[PDB]
Amino acid sequence: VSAVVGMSLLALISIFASCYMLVAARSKCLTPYALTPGAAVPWTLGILCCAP
Amino acid sequence: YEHSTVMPNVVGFPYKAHIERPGYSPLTLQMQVVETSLEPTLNLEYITCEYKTVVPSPYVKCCGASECSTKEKPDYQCKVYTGVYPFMWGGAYCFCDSENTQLSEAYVDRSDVCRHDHASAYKAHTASLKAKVRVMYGNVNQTVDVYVNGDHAVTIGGTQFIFGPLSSAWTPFDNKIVVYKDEVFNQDFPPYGSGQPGRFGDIQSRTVESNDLYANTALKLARPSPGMVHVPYTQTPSGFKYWLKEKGTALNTKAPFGCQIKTNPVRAMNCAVGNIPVSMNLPDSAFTRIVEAPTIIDLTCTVATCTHSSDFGGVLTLTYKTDKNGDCSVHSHSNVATLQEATAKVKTAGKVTLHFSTASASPSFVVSLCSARATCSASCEPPKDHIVPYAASHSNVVFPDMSGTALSWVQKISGGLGAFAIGAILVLVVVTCIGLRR
Ligand SMILES: *[C@@H]1O[C@H](CO)[C@@H](O[C@@H]2O[C@H](CO)[C@@H](O)[C@H](O)[C@H]2NC(C)=O)[C@H](O)[C@H]1NC(C)=O
Ligand SMILES: *[C@@H]1O[C@H](CO)[C@@H](O)[C@H](O)[C@H]1NC(C)=O
């Protein structure tokens, strides 16, 4: 039971960390276009990453 | 050749020893222990046995007075009483109505069966160990008695064996013990000369033949009843009988490790604990040269069936090719599984079968047939029987091999998670690099 719970927590923290880091990477990639007055994101980056 | 090995201290468990010298065929020694005796050094300090009270006939003096002097006897009690009128079957004993005196005295001395029935007390010390070991190899098969202390060297078949010292210094006997007939107890006892009435140690003696004795039993005298001749005395009963009534729980039914305790001399047997180092010096005549030994090439192993249990319920088959028939030495290089046979019968057919015992879900081990070496992996099924009367015949290991099913599942799950993490970190790195280039 200890081994099962330990493996489950390790897997959960791994997947959560990977997802959070991917989301942070997307945010850091798409931040500058939101700060530029006017203009717009290209549809390629808007399809690869969900752009509002 | 000087070689060293460690053997687990379990009675009845066979042990396989491998000897490899370059230029000669490997040799396997079958070693076993048949009985182990653990004896401590004892120094007697006293014994105890039931006592008796000696009281002589009272002295009656008519028309006079008496006065008794003290003597050197254990718990000697004497007293003089005035104003007595003794009576007998005929009539009065003296004319004097109220000028008679009676002297009474009593003491205590060890019983006449103290030599045959007694309980001794002992102080424990460091304990030495003696064992009996059966050794077989080749045409030699013999049992020898050894002192496991690192000193007693035994020569069997022109071969020198040295044993011990034991790796754990553990004894079941506490500092103070009490021995009675066939029973030993780890109960403390009062020191010499400080016994108390009604309990253990009321009567004390240095040895069975000692002439001195220490007694403390609260022997009290009383005044005789009028018109009678007798001596009234009150005394607490013997503490030895009370102790025999309520001695407690014996060590024979309480000792750990299943040690069998026996007396005369006080010792314990079959104490399964620790392990013994052994060192052997072998002659060259007992081995075989290579060019007389068959050469094995392209050795491949497989498993027929496996059911882990205390028995030998596992069989495997080995495939080979040689140049001449003969006898080879077979061994397993891991304690995960244990083989049964030490010598293998090699022939031109190229197929042999072996038995083994194991306790893991999926064992993997390296087998060696003469000079050739191969690997064996298997999957085993649990047994159905619950209770068996024979002891386990394998080392206790349960950790599965890295290639087992469960560990394989863990492995691909971990690999997938690691691949996902590597992809994520690579994506973050490239994003941050292209960001910083700006
Ligand atoms: C015979 O009996 C008389 C008493 O009837 C004893 O005399 C007593 O002796 C003691 C010893 O000194 C005296 O204290 C008493 O006063 C005596 N009694 C009388 C009545 O005189 C005498 O000793 C006895 N003799 C023998 C040989 O037993
Ligand atoms: C070794 O000798 C003992 C003594 O008779 C015997 O019981 C035992 O079976 C022998 N071992 C073998 C392998 O023959």
XYZ file of C-alpha atoms and ligand atoms in Angstrom:
532
model
C 0.000 0.000 0.000
C 2.890 2.371 0.737
C 4.520 1.598 -2.614
C 1.250 2.105 -4.495
C 0.550 5.446 -2.818
C 4.120 6.627 -3.384
C 4.087 5.740 -7.072
C 0.689 7.400 -7.506
C 1.838 10.643 -5.867
C 5.035 10.679 -7.935
C 3.111 10.205 -11.182
C 0.546 12.852 -10.220
C 3.144 15.472 -9.318
C 5.070 14.712 -12.516
C 2.063 15.172 -14.797
C 0.883 18.290 -12.953
C 4.335 19.885 -13.164
C 4.657 19.092 -16.872
C 1.225 20.537 -17.654
C 1.849 23.705 -15.635
C 5.232 24.235 -17.283
C 3.739 23.761 -20.762
C 0.999 26.294 -19.987
C 3.594 28.740 -18.653
C 5.685 28.277 -21.800
C 2.658 29.013 -23.985
C 1.861 32.124 -21.940
C 5.449 33.371 -22.202
C 5.402 32.734 -25.954
C 2.098 34.532 -26.578
C 2.518 37.434 -24.130
C 4.209 39.992 -26.452
C 1.439 40.034 -29.067
C -1.117 41.097 -26.454
C 1.038 44.094 -25.479
C 1.542 45.452 -29.004
C -1.079 48.117 -29.811
C -3.097 47.170 -32.845
C -1.753 44.263 -34.897
C -2.869 40.639 -34.551
C -1.429 37.162 -34.054
C -0.847 35.026 -37.167
C -3.381 32.261 -37.661
C -0.599 29.654 -37.528
C 0.312 30.545 -33.947
C -3.402 30.996 -33.257
C -4.031 27.390 -34.286
C -0.938 25.843 -32.681
C -1.770 27.664 -29.437
C -5.340 28.636 -28.586
C -5.327 32.404 -29.118
C -8.239 34.557 -27.806
C 44.300 -22.971 -1.939
C 42.887 -20.733 0.782
C 39.235 -19.798 0.335
C 36.608 -18.083 2.476
C 32.830 -18.390 2.622
C 29.871 -17.414 4.817
C 27.267 -20.021 5.790
C 23.841 -19.288 7.313
C 23.217 -20.924 10.687
C 20.097 -22.972 9.985
C 19.963 -26.649 10.911
C 19.196 -28.787 7.874
C 19.763 -26.088 5.251
C 22.176 -27.296 2.537
C 24.928 -24.984 1.318
C 26.764 -24.952 -2.016
C 30.335 -23.633 -2.178
C 32.149 -22.877 -5.438
C 35.924 -23.065 -5.899
C 37.462 -21.770 -9.138
C 41.187 -21.977 -9.898
C 42.414 -21.062 -13.387
C 43.562 -24.038 -15.418
C 41.401 -26.496 -13.473
C 37.742 -27.444 -13.449
C 35.498 -25.708 -10.894
C 34.581 -27.659 -7.772
C 31.412 -27.551 -5.667
C 31.326 -28.472 -1.972
C 28.119 -29.597 -0.241
C 28.217 -28.358 3.358
C 25.570 -28.730 6.047
C 25.132 -28.448 9.814
C 23.422 -31.239 11.735
C 23.382 -29.944 15.336
C 24.595 -26.859 17.210
C 25.157 -26.743 20.974
C 25.481 -23.468 22.892
C 26.872 -23.786 26.424
C 27.689 -20.969 28.870
C 30.250 -21.041 31.656
C 28.596 -21.347 35.067
C 29.920 -20.765 38.586
C 27.702 -22.151 41.352
C 27.084 -19.878 44.307
C 24.495 -21.790 46.350
C 21.746 -24.417 46.379
C 18.439 -24.777 48.207
C 16.390 -27.721 49.450
C 13.580 -28.472 51.880
C 14.514 -28.463 55.571
C 13.461 -30.136 58.805
C 13.040 -28.980 62.392
C 14.896 -30.899 65.096
C 13.405 -30.518 68.567
C 14.645 -32.789 71.378
C 12.601 -33.910 74.343
C 11.975 -31.098 76.855
C 13.848 -30.987 80.149
C 11.610 -31.025 83.234
C 13.248 -30.165 86.560
C 11.345 -30.675 89.813
C 12.124 -28.438 92.802
C 14.865 -26.466 91.115
C 15.758 -24.054 88.344
C 17.324 -24.412 84.902
C 19.140 -22.046 82.556
C 20.173 -22.917 79.003
C 23.308 -21.579 77.332
C 23.545 -20.550 73.695
C 25.106 -22.898 71.142
C 26.328 -22.376 67.579
C 23.504 -23.922 65.559
C 21.317 -22.467 62.785
C 18.312 -20.602 64.205
C 18.737 -22.184 67.630
C 15.870 -21.160 69.916
C 15.794 -22.074 73.609
C 13.607 -20.900 76.466
C 12.872 -21.670 80.111
C 9.374 -21.685 81.595
C 8.459 -21.537 85.283
C 5.311 -22.707 87.021
C 4.561 -25.980 85.229
C 2.742 -29.084 86.500
C 3.338 -31.845 83.941
C 1.136 -34.925 83.827
C 1.710 -38.438 82.510
C -0.331 -41.604 82.083
C 0.353 -42.692 85.660
C 0.129 -39.474 87.627
C 1.885 -36.268 88.563
C 5.580 -36.044 87.733
C 6.839 -34.153 90.808
C 5.749 -33.192 94.314
C 6.614 -29.529 93.752
C 3.394 -27.734 92.812
C 4.750 -24.408 91.523
C 8.554 -24.742 91.752
C 9.088 -26.774 88.562
C 10.917 -25.598 85.444
C 10.801 -26.673 81.799
C 13.610 -26.069 79.307
C 12.685 -26.218 75.621
C 14.916 -25.905 72.575
C 14.736 -26.425 68.824
C 16.704 -25.760 65.651
C 16.575 -26.300 61.883
C 18.753 -28.480 59.662
C 18.728 -29.613 56.042
C 16.634 -32.620 55.081
C 18.040 -36.104 54.561
C 17.159 -35.942 50.843
C 18.899 -32.618 50.171
C 21.606 -34.510 48.271
C 19.053 -36.052 45.888
C 16.437 -33.271 45.571
C 17.698 -29.688 45.394
C 17.641 -26.584 43.210
C 20.865 -24.756 42.395
C 21.509 -21.168 41.355
C 24.056 -20.034 38.780
C 25.598 -16.899 37.290
C 26.035 -16.778 33.519
C 29.054 -15.590 31.542
C 30.410 -15.680 28.000
C 29.186 -18.718 26.074
C 31.115 -20.970 23.702
C 29.525 -22.851 20.815
C 30.078 -26.365 19.470
C 28.636 -27.746 16.243
C 28.609 -30.835 14.042
C 29.076 -30.338 10.307
C 28.626 -32.740 7.389
C 30.914 -32.091 4.416
C 30.712 -33.896 1.083
C 32.569 -33.436 -2.203
C 33.696 -35.912 -4.829
C 34.154 -39.264 -3.104
C 34.481 -37.691 0.375
C 31.457 -37.594 2.697
C 31.958 -37.253 6.443
C 30.681 -35.466 9.553
C 33.049 -33.815 12.028
C 32.533 -32.080 15.366
C 33.972 -28.563 15.523
C 34.444 -25.805 18.078
C 33.161 -22.593 16.467
C 35.634 -20.217 18.090
C 38.156 -19.459 15.335
C 40.720 -21.865 16.811
C 39.801 -25.503 16.155
C 41.213 -26.531 12.773
C 39.950 -29.865 11.440
C 41.706 -31.976 8.803
C 39.332 -33.968 6.585
C 40.581 -35.674 3.434
C 43.880 -33.818 3.549
C 41.939 -30.542 3.719
C 42.084 -27.953 6.500
C 38.890 -26.296 7.757
C 38.627 -23.387 10.200
C 35.266 -22.138 11.463
C 33.886 -19.085 13.206
C 33.814 -16.846 15.099
C 30.034 -16.353 15.194
C 28.828 -13.039 13.790
C 26.332 -12.358 16.603
C 26.983 -12.564 20.349
C 23.508 -13.473 21.584
C 22.629 -15.824 24.436
C 19.160 -16.678 25.769
C 20.329 -17.132 29.370
C 20.251 -13.953 31.449
C 22.854 -13.068 34.081
C 21.229 -15.093 36.880
C 19.602 -18.509 36.420
C 18.071 -21.217 38.609
C 18.340 -24.903 37.677
C 16.085 -27.632 39.074
C 16.197 -31.182 37.677
C 15.297 -30.635 34.013
C 14.116 -27.005 34.178
C 15.913 -23.660 33.953
C 14.452 -20.316 35.011
C 15.691 -16.772 34.400
C 14.583 -15.500 37.814
C 16.769 -13.516 40.191
C 17.617 -14.750 43.668
C 18.485 -13.064 46.959
C 22.184 -12.900 47.847
C 23.836 -15.248 50.311
C 22.827 -14.565 53.901
C 19.944 -12.241 52.978
C 17.145 -14.752 52.506
C 13.622 -14.155 53.745
C 11.239 -16.674 55.354
C 8.413 -18.125 53.303
C 10.109 -17.512 49.954
C 12.982 -18.896 47.891
C 16.289 -19.182 49.706
C 15.085 -19.778 53.262
C 17.766 -22.472 53.674
C 21.157 -21.671 52.159
C 24.321 -23.688 51.608
C 27.486 -23.098 49.594
C 27.545 -26.680 48.284
C 25.892 -30.045 48.862
C 28.722 -31.334 51.073
C 29.222 -28.076 52.995
C 29.051 -28.364 56.781
C 27.980 -24.737 57.294
C 24.446 -23.476 56.734
C 22.493 -20.216 56.890
C 18.896 -20.409 58.095
C 16.122 -17.843 58.496
C 12.653 -19.293 59.046
C 11.159 -17.451 62.073
C 11.064 -20.340 64.536
C 9.104 -19.197 67.597
C 8.436 -21.135 70.802
C 5.406 -20.898 73.069
C 4.509 -21.779 76.636
C 3.124 -25.320 77.021
C -0.511 -25.834 77.916
C -1.165 -26.601 81.600
C -1.308 -30.253 82.566
C 0.559 -31.561 79.521
C 4.074 -32.361 78.318
C 4.898 -31.030 74.843
C 6.701 -28.229 73.032
C 4.643 -25.730 70.999
C 6.390 -24.032 68.088
C 5.241 -21.876 65.177
C 7.226 -21.587 61.953
C 6.651 -20.300 58.439
C 6.521 -23.237 55.980
C 9.405 -24.102 53.695
C 9.949 -21.664 50.856
C 11.223 -24.386 48.535
C 7.829 -26.106 48.379
C 6.046 -22.806 47.751
C 8.502 -21.937 44.983
C 7.984 -25.369 43.428
C 4.249 -24.640 43.517
C 4.523 -21.268 41.745
C 7.882 -21.391 39.931
C 6.273 -19.588 36.976
C 6.906 -20.164 33.277
C 9.935 -22.269 32.407
C 12.486 -21.145 29.842
C 11.948 -24.317 27.800
C 8.529 -23.078 26.622
C 9.623 -19.439 26.278
C 13.060 -19.308 24.619
C 13.102 -17.494 21.256
C 14.505 -18.917 18.014
C 13.074 -22.335 18.891
C 16.084 -23.312 20.975
C 15.802 -26.642 22.779
C 17.097 -26.284 26.339
C 18.585 -29.323 28.063
C 20.472 -29.729 31.339
C 23.470 -31.716 32.618
C 25.313 -29.724 31.353
C 23.144 -26.603 30.998
C 22.966 -25.856 27.283
C 20.706 -24.891 24.392
C 20.541 -26.558 20.982
C 19.459 -25.631 17.451
C 19.548 -21.864 17.996
C 18.966 -20.527 14.475
C 20.656 -17.114 14.449
C 23.528 -15.413 12.671
C 26.001 -16.970 10.270
C 29.396 -18.671 10.443
C 32.489 -17.744 8.412
C 34.470 -20.726 7.146
C 37.956 -20.837 5.639
C 39.407 -23.846 3.842
C 42.850 -24.891 2.619
C 42.495 -27.470 -0.189
C 45.083 -29.789 -1.752
C 45.703 -29.988 -5.479
C 44.907 -33.709 -5.751
C 41.182 -33.113 -5.200
C 40.682 -31.043 -8.375
C 40.673 -31.952 -12.065
C 42.648 -30.418 -14.912
C 40.924 -28.802 -17.878
C 42.258 -31.005 -20.677
C 40.718 -34.006 -18.946
C 37.500 -32.078 -18.522
C 34.850 -31.726 -21.238
C 34.566 -28.362 -22.968
C 31.039 -26.922 -23.149
C 30.177 -24.502 -25.964
C 26.987 -22.560 -26.770
C 25.119 -23.128 -23.512
C 21.446 -22.106 -23.511
C 18.965 -22.408 -20.653
C 15.182 -22.527 -20.340
C 12.611 -23.205 -17.625
C 10.120 -26.073 -17.725
C 7.925 -25.098 -14.775
C 8.090 -23.149 -11.524
C 5.889 -23.095 -8.413
C 7.569 -21.405 -5.459
C 7.266 -23.417 -2.244
C 9.332 -24.930 0.545
C 9.732 -28.036 -1.629
C 11.830 -28.272 -4.810
C 8.830 -27.580 -7.037
C 10.668 -26.124 -10.005
C 12.278 -27.903 -12.958
C 14.373 -26.531 -15.823
C 16.209 -27.993 -18.817
C 19.695 -27.158 -20.089
C 21.009 -27.622 -23.643
C 24.647 -28.064 -24.627
C 27.195 -29.783 -26.862
C 30.481 -31.400 -25.814
C 33.317 -33.528 -27.175
C 33.238 -36.361 -24.609
C 30.934 -37.628 -21.882
C 31.720 -37.189 -18.209
C 30.918 -35.453 -14.938
C 30.639 -31.681 -14.506
C 29.995 -29.259 -11.648
C 26.791 -27.195 -11.703
C 26.124 -24.090 -9.624
C 23.839 -21.070 -9.314
C 25.405 -17.637 -8.832
C 22.534 -16.044 -6.895
C 20.670 -16.733 -3.667
C 17.320 -16.001 -5.345
C 17.114 -19.683 -6.301
C 18.805 -22.745 -4.824
C 19.776 -25.879 -6.734
C 19.479 -29.421 -5.420
C 22.247 -31.360 -7.190
C 25.911 -30.372 -7.173
C 27.280 -32.760 -9.825
C 25.830 -33.038 -13.327
C 26.004 -36.046 -15.642
C 27.159 -34.727 -19.030
C 26.792 -36.881 -22.146
C 26.759 -36.655 -25.934
C 22.967 -36.258 -26.169
C 23.168 -32.617 -25.103
C 20.170 -32.297 -22.766
C 20.051 -32.273 -18.960
C 17.332 -31.525 -16.404
C 17.643 -29.908 -12.975
C 15.453 -29.057 -9.984
C 15.493 -25.866 -7.931
C 13.646 -23.924 -5.240
C 12.774 -20.232 -5.208
C 10.543 -17.730 -3.429
C 10.199 -14.856 -5.919
C 7.418 -14.138 -8.387
C 9.900 -13.909 -11.280
C 13.452 -15.141 -10.647
C 16.439 -14.502 -12.875
C 19.747 -16.171 -12.121
C 23.014 -17.195 -13.749
C 23.757 -20.920 -13.896
C 27.174 -22.442 -14.529
C 27.860 -25.905 -15.951
C 31.574 -26.676 -15.669
C 33.321 -23.751 -17.360
C 30.261 -22.627 -19.349
C 27.792 -20.009 -18.157
C 24.201 -19.154 -19.062
C 21.237 -17.137 -17.800
C 17.779 -18.327 -16.765
C 14.594 -16.303 -16.305
C 11.208 -17.710 -15.377
C 7.682 -16.965 -14.195
C 6.317 -18.933 -11.241
C 2.870 -19.596 -9.782
C 1.958 -19.499 -6.078
C 1.201 -22.812 -4.355
C -2.180 -23.953 -3.057
C -1.261 -25.748 0.177
C -1.303 -23.606 3.319
C 0.607 -25.487 6.053
C 3.558 -27.842 5.532
C 5.468 -29.858 8.169
C 8.967 -29.354 6.737
C 11.061 -26.209 7.000
C 11.774 -23.877 4.100
C 14.589 -24.956 1.777
C 15.382 -21.599 0.155
C 16.786 -18.213 1.055
C 14.028 -15.718 1.838
C 13.950 -13.272 -1.074
C 10.820 -11.786 -2.623
C 12.083 -8.884 -4.722
C 11.236 -9.508 -8.398
C 13.709 -9.271 -11.245
C 13.877 -6.046 -13.251
C 12.462 -7.955 -16.246
C 9.376 -9.214 -14.419
C 5.864 -8.311 -15.489
C 5.079 -5.840 -12.699
C 8.462 -4.142 -12.977
C 7.998 -3.988 -16.756
C 4.707 -2.150 -16.237
C 6.403 0.269 -13.861
C 9.134 0.678 -16.457
C 6.977 1.636 -19.416
C 4.812 3.932 -17.272
C 7.947 5.701 -16.036
C 9.342 5.845 -19.566
C 6.192 7.446 -20.942
C 6.121 10.027 -18.166
C 9.811 10.772 -18.697
C 9.316 11.173 -22.443
C 6.467 13.612 -21.807
C 8.630 15.587 -19.374
C 11.544 15.657 -21.830
C 9.286 16.954 -24.590
C 7.910 19.639 -22.285
C 11.359 20.792 -21.161
C 12.612 20.877 -24.758
C 9.620 22.987 -25.810
C 10.162 25.381 -22.906
C 13.876 25.641 -23.710
C 13.315 26.470 -27.375
C 10.568 28.976 -26.533
C 12.738 30.755 -23.966
C 15.746 30.764 -26.305
C 13.811 32.314 -29.189
C 12.402 34.800 -26.686
C 15.829 35.775 -25.364
C 17.287 36.135 -28.870
C 14.955 39.101 -29.461
C 11.104 -34.879 98.038
O 10.000 -33.983 98.062
C 10.233 -32.817 98.865
C 8.947 -32.023 98.863
O 7.833 -32.836 99.207
C 11.422 -32.026 98.323
O 11.712 -30.976 99.239
C 11.739 -29.705 98.565
O 13.062 -29.362 98.139
C 13.146 -28.102 97.459
C 14.579 -27.946 97.007
O 15.266 -26.974 97.783
C 12.688 -26.979 98.387
O 12.706 -25.745 97.680
C 11.283 -27.265 98.899
O 10.902 -26.282 99.854
C 11.224 -28.648 99.539
N 9.871 -28.953 99.974
C 9.560 -29.247 101.240
C 8.115 -29.536 101.513
O 10.409 -29.278 102.126
C 12.647 -32.921 98.180
O 13.684 -32.222 97.502
C 12.306 -34.190 97.406
N 13.452 -35.082 97.359
C 13.773 -35.800 96.279
C 14.989 -36.668 96.404
O 13.113 -35.753 95.246
C 27.036 -39.564 3.490
O 27.179 -40.492 4.573
C 26.036 -40.554 5.441
C 26.384 -41.517 6.552
O 25.909 -42.827 6.272
C 24.798 -40.976 4.653
O 23.662 -40.942 5.508
C 24.583 -40.046 3.466
O 23.504 -40.515 2.668
C 25.849 -39.970 2.620
N 25.667 -39.051 1.509
C 25.549 -39.456 0.241
C 25.364 -38.375 -0.779
O 25.592 -40.641 -0.068
